Design an enzyme around this catalytic site. Structure first.
Site, mmCIF file in Angstrom:
data_model
loop_
_atom_site.group_PDB
_atom_site.id
_atom_site.type_symbol
_atom_site.label_atom_id
_atom_site.label_comp_id
_atom_site.label_asym_id
_atom_site.label_seq_id
_atom_site.Cartn_x
_atom_site.Cartn_y
_atom_site.Cartn_z
ATOM 1 N N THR D 1 0.823 -1.203 0.000
ATOM 2 C CA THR D 1 0.000 0.000 0.000
ATOM 3 C C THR D 1 0.858 1.255 0.000
ATOM 4 O O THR D 1 2.084 1.179 0.035
ATOM 5 C CB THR D 1 -0.941 0.038 1.214
ATOM 6 O OG1 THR D 1 -1.471 1.359 1.368
ATOM 7 C CG2 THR D 1 -0.194 -0.352 2.481
ATOM 8 N N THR D 2 0.206 2.414 -0.037
ATOM 9 C CA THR D 2 0.896 3.702 -0.007
ATOM 10 C C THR D 2 0.002 4.686 0.737
ATOM 11 O O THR D 2 -0.897 5.290 0.146
ATOM 12 C CB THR D 2 1.218 4.198 -1.413
ATOM 13 O OG1 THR D 2 2.409 3.557 -1.888
ATOM 14 C CG2 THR D 2 1.433 5.705 -1.414
ATOM 15 N N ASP D 17 -3.719 4.647 -1.026
ATOM 16 C CA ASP D 17 -4.086 3.957 -2.252
ATOM 17 C C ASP D 17 -5.424 3.255 -2.058
ATOM 18 O O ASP D 17 -6.078 3.385 -1.022
ATOM 19 C CB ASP D 17 -2.987 2.981 -2.658
ATOM 20 C CG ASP D 17 -3.095 1.649 -1.943
ATOM 21 O OD1 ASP D 17 -3.976 0.842 -2.311
ATOM 22 O OD2 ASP D 17 -2.301 1.410 -1.009
ATOM 23 N N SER D 170 0.229 -1.288 -5.058
ATOM 24 C CA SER D 170 -0.624 -0.123 -4.877
ATOM 25 C C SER D 170 -1.182 0.296 -6.227
ATOM 26 O O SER D 170 -0.441 0.407 -7.208
ATOM 27 C CB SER D 170 0.143 1.041 -4.236
ATOM 28 O OG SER D 170 -0.023 1.049 -2.828
#
Lengths: 240, 239, 136, 197, 232, 237, 206
Positions: D1-2, D17, D170
């Site tokens: 993820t981000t 994200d 992501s």
């Protein structure tokens, strides 16, 4: 008679007698007055030295619940000390689980709940000591809460617990705590305590003061001896 | 007959629990009165705010406790036990939210409170909490709701109610009022509650002696009316 | 308690002159605000003075409907001091016999009875007004 | 993820994200990593989804209870403390990093980063998840001081946008939220709105 | 023998569990409740009077469902009834989970009686001051049992508990015929409530529930109004 | 009256009578004097022998190298408190490698004694402890009465006939501070000797002396060891 | 703590006449990445003792809360007694040794140094519990790189000055920067003397 042997037995008219008995027990002790400055909270308790052999500071009734919270127990000293330990435990747990100083309101509420939990069971007796909590923080101002054996605890501008609670309140209502600072309020506290003192029924006493507010960078510490005498000098100036 | 009123788990000869009734009576020890009126689209409760000391902090004496943003309570009776029950109610609401998602309806909230009280009354371990717990709150699909649920463990649905020393008189006044069907509006509900309290107490009701809390369909959040709003409602009531 | 009586002595004739001018209304608002302040300030003497003065102005100007509205408004005021209302009702019942027109007298008696209904302090004034209404 | 957060004057802007892949397959393409923990506080979920979700609810009940009890809006540091204790106690079993941002009347808008391992520290900006090791260089060269709401969004939008293209875990859509005294605004960038290169 | 009317764990010289009898008296001193078992179904009726017009008659229901085919009406202490009903629901669902079949009326009644008896064996726990009356339709045969604080359960064909239960029982054995139907059973139950009912029987004051093969269902104020108008 | 059975029942006047009786329990034991100079904390106790040919009962117990006690009360509770204080001192040594402060140990003793005076299940600790120790702040002479309240005293004295010792200590408090070990011990012995009746005299077989100082570990002197201190004491008038 | 996630660099400290000085980096390197670069690895416990440690900062952060409350309780009693630098050291040794015995030890190699009653104290309790007293101590790599240097200065002259101590660590962490893959050019310096404990920083190098 009959309904007042246990704290879990409601009186026929609807009053838990053991709680009232604990209130009387706290009423049987010396006075302790907490006055809220405009920028702090000041505690003052008349500590009677029962014998001349004591070490001028023994069994002091001013306890530091936490860094910023001062406690001014008056009554059964053993119960007061136990309550101080529980208050310190609650403050430590609050700081550990939340990371910031426990607000005086929340610490007072939790300690009051603990005290009230001891007036609901037959195997335990109500605490025989009434205590007042004081603290200062720029974020939340200065707060002064008093919790008695019954468990009730709402904030006070100024309160007195002990023998001459009414006498202390008579001459504390004549003080403007809304605007005064924590510098002259200490002298006022010393004078008010000295006024409320039998001096013919109690042989002697060792006035001990305490404060927490802006003048103390928000921390609660014993009033410095240099200025504590000044309060004593003012009290002596007051004839009573 | 009178020898069975020393334990909460002992039945009286005629089939009564004397300790529960004793706690009910103890409810009045605070010397206060609280009334709740359920309007067409609002729920308003007013309770006395006694401050018999100049050194007390009027902001810390309020008896109107907010269990949740959507649910409200007013504790009447013993202060310490009332506050303990309010804390337990907050815990119950939080746990209900955490375990089922949707906010616990007021009826369920202090039905859980009353079940706790009853389990207290059955097993003789703790003195019953001598404090009547009056709940308000807007419930979707059921309009405003006010529930009074007491030490012995009885909760019921109320169009209007009251707990405290002057409970019978206030309930009789409400019955006299609740019967002439009329527009139960926010202003009307607050006015009727304040009027009932004033007549029961026979007091001029200075703004600093009363504390009001209202929940409405338009704004379904517990709001404690300030001094200005209470004074405006009182002046409207007078004229 | 603040004892606004000194202020009322000076503010009464000034507004009375404007009222006798005929415009009234604004005088009604000024006296109403002054009465509100005095009653909230526990000014029994000055509250009674202002009430009697305003009722007298209304009666003298011949604002019969205005007299009725103002009488009811000052009688139903929040926490209205009992003595001021008693003196106002006394002045109204002393004026009732002075007014001769049957409709206006009947309406004034009706308003006076409505204001004094269920009140112990103006009980004998209510008895006298009831006797007057019965006679009429 | 981000998940990224950056605090400005008078508020904080946070974004994440919308990609949640179960191994080599994207189970959900509309995930929300901007979890509202209170009226004016949010937490970004990175790591194990179940651990992220469950810890999210657990923090809500404790903080929600605390907020009601104190009848005063919770401090962001209060949110930071609970996540640190919950994660550290369960660290050997709990794999999830929570970046919590919010605003309080006590000190303003703050962002606290709690990476996998119960590490609690407050910083102006913080990027977590697998994609964090991709925009690290690009985010550093774009960070500044005094960003306004419009400036903050452009930073957050591009910062997440850069990693999304450069990272494979992501993707999907852009989620953002602005938390300040006035309120919280939740904006989602999908399709053309996301900057490209 | 006043000395042994206090503890539930001690035997009186004659051999009477005094506290159980006192709890039964407290039960008989509660709100009326009458139920009649018909060859087609069962009927349960309780009088729901609030002390004033200020009480929402619909907030608290004396007749509550335990499952799709079990019912419950009480006469005595309602707060105890709430815990009794919670335990009954838990027992029914435990039986369903373990056996994946709706708990038969007999077994649910037996387990509720066991729960009741659980509280009458140790000092410090007050016997349940409410006597439950359970409906049911299992295996195509209507059931009606009454569970008491003493733990004993019976198979009442038709009985009335609470205040004026003697008058209700006397009314029964007179207007009760073993070959009735659900509508006639409802009419008889309403009449039985009437003969022990003070004041007008409004739709909101009498709560009834039919528990036939279709299942247990609390009649809404509309159906109760229709039935009372038909009888009236 | 009827409020005289349990520690959890409050009297109408506001007293827990059981605590008062536990406090009275101290006076059944032998008198003990504890006093502290600038650098020493010496406590002298009188030992009572059940029979003429039975060893005199131990009265000054050993807790740690820097914490001594005198037990004036129930032997059971005295021994239990001594064991608990020994455990606390050992724990402080093990975890902190530092002598546990006398004040903190006294506070722990008070906290532990408070619980028996607040919850039904056990009687209050009916033993009066005179804790003497040396720490960073100098000598400490505490007294821990069964009421769960302890008093930091310069020279306390509990037990039967202890009023005379307390009066003598009040009279001679001033000289206590600026006195050596010998003078402190002699003043304590005089205080104990005041408590005894006219006939009895401070013999070597019924006096126990305990001293903790700046560089001297706790020492319990019994039998001949007390002789060097006892000799030279002024004959009682 | 079975797999450290955020770790720390070396921690250095050399004792001089009148006090003791410690220094540490501010680079929290999750694995090989500089996860955080504004963290403090040296915070004071009381007026006469200070500590700093390597390893899991989260594990050390837990220690910060424990010591703070454990230290804060010291002054709440207001009896005068305060945990001596050895006192904290002894607590630490049993603290980690007790934790290690249950297969959940703190992967945090601490160093505690302070000034008490005219004598300096410089102890080091490793992530497992080993602890000793040395005039100069370096955690982790510092033992490999800076630690050998400190013996040379102490071996020929066991007495050092504050300036001699200040640059000595700088010549110690400087070589740390050159020959280390986890160091960072921003470190704090902790000085403890009669006047108290003071923390300042960071500092760079050429």
């Amino acid at each position: 008679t009959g309904y007042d042997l246990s704290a879990s037995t409601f009186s026929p008219d609807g009053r838990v007698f053991q709680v009232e008995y604990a209130m009387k027990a706290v009423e049987n002790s010396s006075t302790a007055i907490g006055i809220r400055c405009k920028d702090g909270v000041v505690f003052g308790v008349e500590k009677l030295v029962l014998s001349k052999l004591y070490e001028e500071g023994s069994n002091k009734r001013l306890f530091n619940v936490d860094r910023h919270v001062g406690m001014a127990v008056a009554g059964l000293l053993a119960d007061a000390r136990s309550l101080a330990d529980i208050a310190r435990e609650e403050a430590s747990n609050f700081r550990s689980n939340f990371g910031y100083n426990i607000p005086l309101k929340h610490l007072a509420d939790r300690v009051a709940m603990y005290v009230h939990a001891y007036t609901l069971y037959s195997a335990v007796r109500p605490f025989g000591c009434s205590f007042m909590l004081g603290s200062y923080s720029v974020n939340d101002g200065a707060q002064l809460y008093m919790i008695d054996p019954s468990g009730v605890s709402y904030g006070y501008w100024g309160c007195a617990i002990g023998k001459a609670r009414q006498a202390a309140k008579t001459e504390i209502e004549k003080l403007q705590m809304k605007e005064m600072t924590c510098r002259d309020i200490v002298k006022e506290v010393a004078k008010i305590i000295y006024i409320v003192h039998d001096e013919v029924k109690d042989k002697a006493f060792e006035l001990e003061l305490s404060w927490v507010g802006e003048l103390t960078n928000g921390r609660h510490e014993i009033v410095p001896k240099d200025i504590r005498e000044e309060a004593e000098k003012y009290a002596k100036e007051s004839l009573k | 007959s009178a020898g069975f009123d020393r334990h909460i788990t002992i039945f009286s000869p005629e089939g009564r629990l004397y300790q529960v009734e004793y706690a009910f009576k103890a409810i009045n020890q605070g010397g206060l009165t609280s009334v709740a009126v359920r309007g067409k689209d609002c729920a308003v409760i007013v309770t006395q705010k006694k401050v018999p000391d100049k050194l007390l902090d009027s902001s810390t004496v309020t008896h109107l406790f907010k269990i949740t943003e959507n649910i409200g309570c007013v504790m009447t009776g013993m202060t310490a036990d009332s506050r303990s029950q309010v804390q337990r109610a907050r815990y119950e609401a939080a746990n209900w939210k955490y375990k089922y998602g949707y906010e616990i309806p007021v009826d369920m909230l202090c039905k859980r409170i009353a079940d706790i009280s009853q389990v207290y009354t059955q097993n003789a371990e703790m003195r019953p909490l001598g404090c009547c717990m009056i709940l308000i709150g807007i419930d979707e699909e059921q309009g405003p709701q006010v529930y009074k649920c007491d030490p012995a463990g009885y909760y019921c649905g109320f169009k209007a109610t009251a707990a405290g020393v002057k409970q019978t008189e206030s309930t009789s006044f409400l019955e006299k009022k609740v019967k002439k069907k009329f527009d139960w509006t926010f202003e009307q509900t607050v006015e009727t509650a304040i009027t009932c309290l004033s007549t029961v107490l026979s007091i001029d009701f200075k703004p600093s002696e009363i504390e009001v809390g209202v929940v409405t369909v338009e704004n379904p959040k517990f709001r404690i009316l300030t001094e200005a709003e209470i004074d405006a409602h009182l002046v409207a009531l007078a004229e | 308690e603040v004892d606004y009586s000194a202020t009322v002595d000076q503010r009464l004739p000034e507004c009375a002159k404007l009222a006798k001018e005929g415009r009234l209304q604004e005088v009604i608002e000024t006296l109403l605000s002054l009465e509100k302040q005095t009653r909230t300030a526990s000014d029994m003497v000055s509250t009674s003075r202002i009430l009697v003065a305003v009722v007298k102005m209304c009666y003298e100007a011949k604002e019969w409907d205005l007299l009725n509205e103002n009488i009811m408004l000052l009688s139903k005021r929040r926490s209205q001091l009992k003595q001021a209302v008693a003196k106002m009702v006394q002045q109204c019942c002393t004026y009732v016999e002075e007014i001769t027109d049957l409709p206006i007298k009947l309406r004034l008696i009706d308003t006076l009875r409505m204001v004094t209904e269920g009140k112990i302090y103006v009980e004998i004034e209510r008895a006298r007004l009831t006797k007057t209404l019965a006679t009429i | 993820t981000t998940i990224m957060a950056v605090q400005f004057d008078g508020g904080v802007v946070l974004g994440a994200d919308s990609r949640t892949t179960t191994g080599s397959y994207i189970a959900n393409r509309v995930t929300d990593k901007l979890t509202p923990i209170h009226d004016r506080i949010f937490c970004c979920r990175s790591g194990s989804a179940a651990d992220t979700q469950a810890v999210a609810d657990a923090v809500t009940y404790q903080l929600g209870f605390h907020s009601i009890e104190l009848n005063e809006p919770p401090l962001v540091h209060t949110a930071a403390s609970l996540f640190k204790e919950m994660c550290y106690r369960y660290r050997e079993d709990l794999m999830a990093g929570i970046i919590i941002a919010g605003w309080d009347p006590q000190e303003g808008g703050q962002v606290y980063s709690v990476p996998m391992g119960g590490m609690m520290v407050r910083q102006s900006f913080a990027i977590g998840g697998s994609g964090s090791s991709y925009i690290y260089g690009y985010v550093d060269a774009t960070y500044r001081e005094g960003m306004t709401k419009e400036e903050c969004l452009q930073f957050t939008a591009n910062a997440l946008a850069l990693a999304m293209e450069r990272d494979g875990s992501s993707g999907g859509v852009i989620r953002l939220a602005a938390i300040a005294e006035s309120g919280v605004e939740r904006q989602v960038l999908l399709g053309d709105q996301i900057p490209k290169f | 023998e006043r000395g042994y009317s206090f503890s539930l764990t001690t035997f009186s010289p004659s051999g009477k569990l005094v506290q159980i009898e006192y709890a039964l008296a407290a039960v008989a001193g509660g709100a009326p409740s009458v139920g009649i078992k018909a060859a087609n179904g069962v009927v349960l009726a309780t009088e729901k009077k609030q002390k004033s017009i200020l009480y929402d008659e619909r907030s608290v229901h004396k007749v509550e469902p335990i499952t799709k085919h079990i019912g419950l009406v009480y006469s005595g202490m309602g707060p105890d009834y709430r815990v009794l009903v919670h335990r009954a629901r838990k027992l029914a669902q435990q039986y369903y989970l373990v056996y994946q079949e709706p708990i038969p009326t007999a077994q649910l009644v037996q387990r509720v009686a066991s729960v009741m008896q659980e509280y009458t064996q140790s000092g410090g726990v007050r016997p349940f001051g409410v006597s439950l009356l359970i409906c049911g339709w299992n295996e195509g045969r209507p059931y009606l049992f009454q569970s008491d604080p003493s733990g004993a359960y019976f198979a009442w064909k038709a009985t009335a508990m609470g205040k004026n239960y003697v008058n209700g029982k006397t009314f029964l054995e007179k207007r009760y015929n073993e070959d009735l139907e659900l509508e006639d059973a409802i009419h008889t139950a309403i009449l039985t409530l009437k003969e022990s009912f003070e004041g007008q029987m409004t739709e909101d004051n009498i709560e009834v529930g039919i528990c036939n093969e279709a299942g247990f269902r609390r009649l809404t104020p509309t159906e109760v109004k229709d039935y009372l108008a038909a009888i009236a | 009256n009827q409020y005289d059975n349990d520690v959890t029942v409050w009297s109408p006047q506001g007293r827990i009578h059981q605590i008062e009786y536990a406090m009275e329990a101290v006076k059944q034991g032998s008198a003990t004097v504890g006093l502290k100079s600038k650098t020493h904390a010496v406590l002298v106790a009188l030992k009572r022998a059940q029979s003429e040919l039975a060893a005199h009962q131990k009265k000054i117990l050993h807790v740690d190298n820097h914490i001594g006690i005198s037990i004036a009360g129930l032997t059971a509770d005295a021994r239990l408190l001594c064991n608990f204080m020994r455990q606390e001192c050992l724990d402080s040594r093990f975890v902190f490698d530092r002598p546990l402060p006398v004040s903190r140990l006294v506070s722990l003793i008070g906290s532990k004694t408070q619980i028996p005076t607040q919850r039904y299940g056990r009687r209050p600790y009916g033993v009066g402890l005179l804790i003497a120790g040396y720490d960073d702040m100098g000598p400490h002479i505490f007294q821990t009465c069964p009421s769960a309240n302890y008093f930091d005293c310069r020279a306390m004295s509990i037990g039967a006939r202890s009023q005379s010792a307390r009066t003598y200590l009040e009279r001679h408090m001033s000289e206590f501070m600026e006195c050596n070990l010998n003078e402190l011990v002699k003043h304590g012995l005089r205080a104990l000797r005041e408590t005894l009746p006219a006939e009895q005299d401070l013999t070597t077989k019924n006096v126990s002396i305990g001293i903790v100082g700046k560089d001297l570990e706790f020492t319990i002197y019994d039998d001949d060891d007390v002789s060097p201190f006892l000799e030279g004491l002024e004959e009682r008038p | 703590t079975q797999n450290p996630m955020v770790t720390g660099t070396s921690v250095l400290g050399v004792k001089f006449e009148g006090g003791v000085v410690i220094a540490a980096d501010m680079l929290g390197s999750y694995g090989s990445l500089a996860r955080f670069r504004n963290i403090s690895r040296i915070m004071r416990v009381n007026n006469s003792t200070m500590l700093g440690a390597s390893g899991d900062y989260a594990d050390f952060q837990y220690l910060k809360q424990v010591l703070g409350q454990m230290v804060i309780d010291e002054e709440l009693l207001g009896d005068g007694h305060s945990y001596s630098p050895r006192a904290i050291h002894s607590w630490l040794t049993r603290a980690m040794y007790s934790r290690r015995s249950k297969m959940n030890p703190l992967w945090n190699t601490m160093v505690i140094g302070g000034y008490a009653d005219g004598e300096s104290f410089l102890g080091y309790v490793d992530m497992l519990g080993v602890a000793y007293e040395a005039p100069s101590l370096a955690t982790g790599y510092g033992a490999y790189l800076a630690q050998p240097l400190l013996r040379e200065v102490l071996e020929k002259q066991p007495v050092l000055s504050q300036t001699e101590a200040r640059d000595l660590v700088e010549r110690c962490m400087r070589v740390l920067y050159y020959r280390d893959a986890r160091s960072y050019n921003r470190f704090q310096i902790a000085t403890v003397t009669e006047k108290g404990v003071e923390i300042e920083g960071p500092l760079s190098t050429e």
